[PDB]
Every structure is written in structure tokens, then in C-alpha cells.
Symmetry: D2
Subunit: 232 residues, 4 copies
Amino acid sequence: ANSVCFTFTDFESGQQDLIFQGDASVGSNKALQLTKVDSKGNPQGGSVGRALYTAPIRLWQSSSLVASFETTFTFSISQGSSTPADALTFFIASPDTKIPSGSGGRLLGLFGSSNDNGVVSVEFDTYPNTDIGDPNYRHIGIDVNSIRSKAASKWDWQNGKTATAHISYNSASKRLSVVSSYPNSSPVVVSFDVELNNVXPXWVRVGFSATTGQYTQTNNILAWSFRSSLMG
Amino acid sequence: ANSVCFTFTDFESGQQDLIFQGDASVGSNKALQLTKVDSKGNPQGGSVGRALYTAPIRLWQSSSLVASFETTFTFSISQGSSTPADALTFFIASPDTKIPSGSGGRLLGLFGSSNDNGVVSVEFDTYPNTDIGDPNYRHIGIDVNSIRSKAASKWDWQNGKTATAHISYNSASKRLSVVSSYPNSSPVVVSFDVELNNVXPXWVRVGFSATTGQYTQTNNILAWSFRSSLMG
Amino acid sequence: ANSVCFTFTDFESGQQDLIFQGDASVGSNKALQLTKVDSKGNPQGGSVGRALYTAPIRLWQSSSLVASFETTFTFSISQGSSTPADALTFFIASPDTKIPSGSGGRLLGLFGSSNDNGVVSVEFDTYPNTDIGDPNYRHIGIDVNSIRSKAASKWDWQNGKTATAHISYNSASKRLSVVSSYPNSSPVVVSFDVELNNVXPXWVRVGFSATTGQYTQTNNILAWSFRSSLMG
Amino acid sequence: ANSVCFTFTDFESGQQDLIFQGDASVGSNKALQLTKVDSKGNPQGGSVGRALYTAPIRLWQSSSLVASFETTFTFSISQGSSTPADALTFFIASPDTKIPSGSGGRLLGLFGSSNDNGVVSVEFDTYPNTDIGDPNYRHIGIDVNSIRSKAASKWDWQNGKTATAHISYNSASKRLSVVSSYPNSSPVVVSFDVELNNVXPXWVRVGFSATTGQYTQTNNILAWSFRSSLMG
Ligand SMILES: OC[C@H]1O[C@H](O[C@H]2[C@@H](O)[C@H](O)[C@@H](CO)O[C@@H]2O)[C@@H](O)[C@@H](O)[C@@H]1O
Ligand SMILES: OC[C@H]1O[C@H](O[C@H]2[C@@H](O)[C@H](O)[C@@H](CO)O[C@@H]2O)[C@@H](O)[C@@H](O)[C@@H]1O
Ligand SMILES: OC[C@H]1O[C@H](O[C@H]2[C@@H](O)[C@H](O)[C@@H](CO)O[C@@H]2O)[C@@H](O)[C@@H](O)[C@@H]1O
Ligand SMILES: OC[C@H]1O[C@H](O[C@H]2[C@@H](O)[C@H](O)[C@@H](CO)O[C@@H]2O)[C@@H](O)[C@@H](O)[C@@H]1O
Ligand SMILES: [Ca+2]
Ligand SMILES: [Ca+2]
Ligand SMILES: [Ca+2]
Ligand SMILES: [Ca+2]
Ligand SMILES: [Mn+2]
Ligand SMILES: [Mn+2]
Ligand SMILES: [Mn+2]
Ligand SMILES: [Mn+2]
């Protein structure tokens, strides 16, 4: 479509307009639980889950004057183990994208390696994996075809509290930016200059991905709005 | 989703965010050709085709204060034979809706009979089939679970010209209305009091359906915008 | 404009995009206090106030296929005296509309009499004034050029609680409807068949009006969104 | 307001939701003629005119997570004299902004000098005034408190043809970008990194400005849509 927008104030079990992958599901709390949480509410380890809006989105078209999208979502991350892991992220990929093999834990279910098939995402990393590029502290990062963020900023994750994140991009400015914050707190912003049409196909699907590894945490999306438009 | 909107200014072959049924396809003209048109541009008889937005839409929710939707679309109908047939329509049905068996010609591919599984549609009827309720003239009608329109008005179809139609409804007014017109012409309006949640499931898919029978015509959708919202 | 939409999640003192009339102002609570409330927070009697969006709105145009608008707002009404009065309302009038002389108390600041200059409003009446048509109980009503509601329904006002109201209309259905409710409560709906272009000018201004008389209550608008569109 | 959007597909004489300054008016062609055009349709010299949306817009708020706006408009510039002058522009300024004294011709009615009261605009310059910074060719530029563009690109203006321009900005990316083009042509883009809240007040009014000097041209806005939102 030339333009598309949708808003989820909450979710229900089986949410018909979402494609669920891995362990992703909707809990009795009406939250999108990307990763596994048991009956007692304890997040499980070695979990991976993703959810995508059912309809493919036309993110770019050569004949268009400008293309843009923006998405805002709220999420809660509560540690299970004394220390949280691994993270959640908003991502954009080909319509037929699926959880890559071996993408667990530190790969956030986005990539099958720690090195037409492009992957762009904004990660909210709760566990520093320094041997693969992670700064030694929690952070938010912009990943383009690699778990190794092209840009990242220290992020003061708050256990259990609801965070609000806003992601934006248009083909004129060619800059992907994300701003995230908690109530009564200082926001964190991350930006990266990139022309998405050079790393992503014309058609994509958008959503979230998350994982736990040895360490755990809930990765719940509470609300989500998305908008994309192609102007000609 | 609590709200969803999309806009198609035109279409392309294989339009990824549309579900094609029957003969429906997109032509080199970038129009959604619901029914079959040959290489020379001649509409074929005995054709049936429908197209639905890929994502299911939450049209109602008990907890909502009000639910509404509106859609505007442009379409062109050019006769193949000296007299046009059969018609096209905007419709709403269950997500897994499929072309009913024996729904050709006068049934507009919407119903399998000329008498959870509800069907609501606004038909743009170009061929009067009087033995099944059609007034003896072209008309626009609102159908609820039956090809026999609950409400209809004379429609002065214009061969080949681009028509504009607007359909609206909200659960407060409980009135489905459609207004359609051609440039430099007098619009036609049709309304019917109905509470959609009593004839349609919570989740549906929306789109178009069209057919030709013994007589033919093109049934092309040129542009289409749709919006639905659930307020709580 | 052919279409216009605005959203107020809250308000500030002097709200630059609002026209204040009478006692209307914004409190430290960030709420639009239509009627006077003293330093201690006690609503004052004999008060009248209205607030309008600064920009005139084109509600109708002869060349348009269809015209529609919808507005949603939250409001709180807390009695000052043992019994509340008088009410608040959403209204539409000419751009240069002003508080009519003698419109206090039971006239809700909308009309100068209890009998191009049209006035359409949805009143939330907290004090039954039976000698002028009010049913003997609190209600919501649709007024067209008269304080005597053309349509009304019993309304179970709840002291202090935040109510949510949704008002809608389009020129195809020609039915003005309002649905209002409190959390964990049963909504109330009021509808009236009317073709607004026959009682209102093409251009108008929209907003709220409220009053207290012998008896008092706060008349606070907490949030407000409005949308209007003319399709051609 | 926290968010506001409006769309003008065309204009009428006296357009009630616009503030007209200088020579700005609406012609029989339904176009916003920023500068003077006589009865015969000949653009007049030494003209200056501006038009602003009547309602003030809240472009920034300290408590907001992110602030953004985007506007798209079509315009036609037909030379009167053998060579066109001077230009038109989209601009943002304080709500009470007025045509500065001595802002004619090369100053595009935006500044009173060729060197809380900030002025940000995107100029479409049809006449190179090299002694004041203009590159020696037609161009589009981003001006911040000065007629001397902070960023500019060569612009292949086409006499009489309808151009389409899209301007965007959000407080996360902190980059103001404009893309403009004619049908069947190569677009031109101009971007400048700037944090608008450091050069503009919280509240502003938005619109267009244009002028002719010794040389002339029409400066007609044919359509205009604007959107701004503050997310918290
Ligand atoms: O969920 C955390 C982490 O768990 C697993 O990695 C463990 C160990 O192998 C690593 O060397 C250290 C690095 O500090 O972290 C854990 O102790 C993996 O599942 C990994 O993907 C994940 O990030
Ligand atoms: O496409 C027109 C029409 O064609 C076929 O019906 C024909 C005949 O059987 C009917 O009695 C008359 C009624 O006037 O119409 C045609 O001549 C069928 O395919 C029918 O569904 C369709 O409407
Ligand atoms: O604010 C309530 C009411 O107060 C005043 O009217 C009083 C009296 O004159 C009326 O007869 C009775 C009717 O029950 O109500 C009050 O006691 C007026 O200001 C009136 O406009 C207002 O509704
Ligand atoms: O509208 C064009 C231009 O006209 C006037 O300037 C003239 C002259 O004074 C300048 O030196 C040359 C520079 O090439 O241009 C004109 O001939 C002024 O009104 C000026 O503001 C304007 O741009
Ligand atoms: Ca990590
Ligand atoms: Ca028929
Ligand atoms: Ca009363
Ligand atoms: Ca110049
Ligand atoms: Mn990381
Ligand atoms: Mn029929
Ligand atoms: Mn009353
Ligand atoms: Mn210049």
C-alpha cells in the first residue's frame, strides 16, 4: 500500500493480525510476551520469539518522492534471574523472514551469525556480550545486517518499569533514529545515517524479536503503533 | 489492531498485501482487475474474482465504546458486450472467506445462494436480475447475508468513467451508508440501519468481489483507502 | 481545509490554540476548567465559560461527496454543592459565536432563549430543569438551535469520575450520535437524524460550553481529539 | 495541541482558516497566489505576500519524548518577465510573525536584513542574488534566521509546471530535509542538521511567503498538507 498505519493498545491470545514465531505469545496480562514465561510468571531461559504484523509493508518504491515510517511502542523487561538477558528489538526484514538457526541468546533471534535478505533493527540490549562488540553496559543499538550495532548508546534499563520508544526514518534525511525513556527519567537517543533502500527490499514485514539465554527476563510489548507512507 | 488504515493509490502485479481469489489480478494499467480481461483488453464472460487486504481487521470488540470504519475507492466499469454485467462490490466477511461455489454472474461472487459466516457488502449492480429481487434498472445496494439487497437506489452507471464511492459505519449510529458519484454528475446514496456486530464476527477481512456472466464488463478498482478504529 | 484533525492530551494556561470565552481557563491540574473554580478548588456558582479551537473548520461544501467529523473527549464533573449543576456540552456554531446574553445556568451558555446562526450541541445535563423540557433525571441530549433537546437519554453521571464521550456524524448517514461512559460502567447512546448542512453554515468553530447556576460543579475537559474531512 | 494535521486540496477567496499578509490572496483558479497577479493573469513586480494557518502550532514541549512535523505542497511558478523572480518558501515563525519591513524581492518577505523571534524556512529561489550568498543558479535552500541559506542545492525550476515538495523533521534525528520534484523529472534534496527547539519558540505558526522584485513570476500554492505531533 502507499500508506499504512495500525495501532495496538493491547493484545489478545492468538492476535489474528500478528504472525507469531518461536515462543512468542500473548499472556493473560494482554501483553505480547516475546519470550517464554511460565505459569508462575517466571521468564524461561533459552527462549526466542518474534511477532510480525501479518500484512507485508511497502517500505520503498523507486517512483516515490519520499518514503518514511515511524513506530512507537511500550515494553516491560523484568529480570527472572538476578541479572537480565538478553534483549528485545524492533526489526524490519523480508516478508518471509524467519528465526535464523542459532540466533538464540546474544543474537536476539535476529541473526544466525555473530559476524534481498537484509535485516535492520533497533536493539534494547540488557546483557553486555563484549566478545561480540557490545559495550560493557546495557544499551540501545541500531543494527544493519549484523548483531554488531552500527550505532549505540548507554541505556539505563529499569527493571519492570514500562519504557516508551519511538523509532523514525524517511528517505530524504536518510537517518534512522530511536528515542526511548521511562517516566520521570532522562531519555536516550541513538541515530545512524543509512539509506534503508540500499539494505532492505521494497517489501518487508515489521515487528519484534527477543531472547533470553543463560540469563532471563520478560520481553513484553504492551502497546504498538506503526505508520509508513510513500509519497509520489 | 485497535485501529488500522491503508491507502492504495494504484496497484502492481502480485500486490503482496492483497489476497487474490478467482480471476482477480492487477493489469499493466496498474488497476485491480477483479474480473478477467484478455490481452486485447476485452472483458471475459463467466468470470469471478475477489481481492482482500492481507491482514485480518478487528471490526468489533465488546469492551469498546464505539467501532467504526470508512472506505473510499474509485472504480471503472466498461462494458465488453453491448450490455454490461454483472457488477462489483465492497464486502466484509470472515477472514477465511472464499468464493462460494456457484456464486458466479448475478451472485457477484459473494453468495452461493440466491435466497460466524456473515457477509455484508455494498453492490454496484450493472445488470438487473429481476427474478431475484433486482429493481429493473442499474443500482447500488446494501446486502446483508443475501444477494437480495436490504436497501438499494437507482444508479446511473457511466461506461468507462471513473466513479468514486464512500462507505461508512460506526456502532453508535448503527447505519451503513454509501455515496457514489461520477465527475460532473449527481451522487447517489444508499443507507441501511444495521448493527454490524450482530451479523459479522469480531474479526473480518475486507475487500472487493466482482463477476461477469453471459454479459461482460471490466470491474477495475483504481484506488482504495480504508480506515477502522475501536475506541475504548 | 478539506480535512483537519487535532489532539489535546492535556492543556496549559493560555493554551494558544484555544479561544477562551467567559470564565473558561486552564487549571494547575492541566484540565480545561470551563467554569470557575476557586483557589481551594471549589466550583463557583453563576459561572459560564466556553472554549473553541482557534481555527475555523469547514464542515460542509456543496461540491463534496461526503462530509464527516468525529470527536472524542474525557471530562470530569464534581459537584460543589450537595447537588450538581448545570452541565457542559460539545457544540458547533458560526466562527464568530459568542456567549449569548442571558445564557447562564440552565441554558448552558449555548442559547439566550429557553424557547447562519445555527447551534448544534451535545449536552451532558446534570440538573433537570423540567419547566424547559428536561426529563426528570440527568441525561445527555442533542440540541439543534434549542436548549430543548431533539433527542436525549438518561445519563448516570458519576461524581468526579472521568467520563469518555464520542460524537460522530457524516453527511451520508445524516445521523448525529454520541456514546458516553465511565470505566466499569454501561455506556449511554443518543442519536438524532439530522442533515447538519441545513442548520449550520459551511464554516464553523467547535468546542465546549458549560455553566453552573444556583448549584455548582466543575466542568473540566481533560483531553480532546477532533477530526473532520470533506471528500470530493 | 499534542498533534495537528490539516489538508488543503485547493483554496477559496477569503479562506477563513488562513491568515493573509501583504498581497497574498486566492484566485479564481482556486490557487493560493502569494504574490500579486493582475486581471489578465500577469504577475506584478515589487510584490510580497504570505499566508499562515490560522491556528498556532505547538512545535515543541520540554516534556515530550519526540516532536516532528512534515508538510507536502504543490506549487506553480510562471515567469511574468522574460526571467523569473524572486521565490517562494515554506516557513515557520512566532505566531505573531509579520512581513518584516524591507523584506521585498531578494529577501522573500522572510527577513528584514540580508545579514523568540526565530525564522526557519525552505526557500525555492528562482533568481540568483550572488551578492548575498545565492549560488549562481536557481536553488532550494534551508534558511535559519538568515536569507543566507545554511544548506542549498541546485534546483531545475520548470516554468509553469506543478512542483511537489515534501519537508520533514523530528527532534530525534535533528535533521530538516526537503525533497522537491516535477513530473517525469529528477528530484532535488536538501538537508541541514539543526535542532529546531534551539532556534524556534515552543509555539509557532506555519505557512508560505513569496515575493517578486524587479523581475516577476506567479507564486501559487495549489495544495498543502501539514502534520505535527508531540509524543510523550
Ligand atoms: O543470556 C546471557 C548469555 O548466556 C549465554 O552466555 C553465557 C556464557 O557462555 C558467556 O561467555 C557469558 C558472557 O558474559 O554470558 C553467559 O554467562 C549465551 O546464551 C549468550 O548468548 C547469552 O547472551
Ligand atoms: O451476465 C448476465 C447474466 O447472464 C446469465 O443470465 C442470462 C439468463 O439466464 C437470464 O435469464 C437473463 C435475465 O435477464 O440474463 C442473462 O441473459 C447468468 O450468468 C446470470 O447470472 C447473469 O446475471
Ligand atoms: O443551577 C441550578 C439552577 O439554578 C437556578 O434555578 C433555581 C430555581 O430558580 C429553579 O426554579 C429550580 C428548578 O428546580 O432550580 C434552581 O433551584 C437557575 O440558575 C437555573 O438556570 C439553574 O439550572
Ligand atoms: O526581482 C529581482 C531583483 O530585483 C531587484 O534587484 C535588481 C538589481 O538591483 C540587482 O543588482 C540585480 C542583481 O542581479 O537584480 C535586479 O536586477 C531587487 O528587487 C532584488 O531584491 C530582486 O532580487
Ligand atoms: Ca547483548
Ligand atoms: Ca444484478
Ligand atoms: Ca438542565
Ligand atoms: Ca534569490
Ligand atoms: Mn548489543
Ligand atoms: Mn442487485
Ligand atoms: Mn437538558
Ligand atoms: Mn537563495
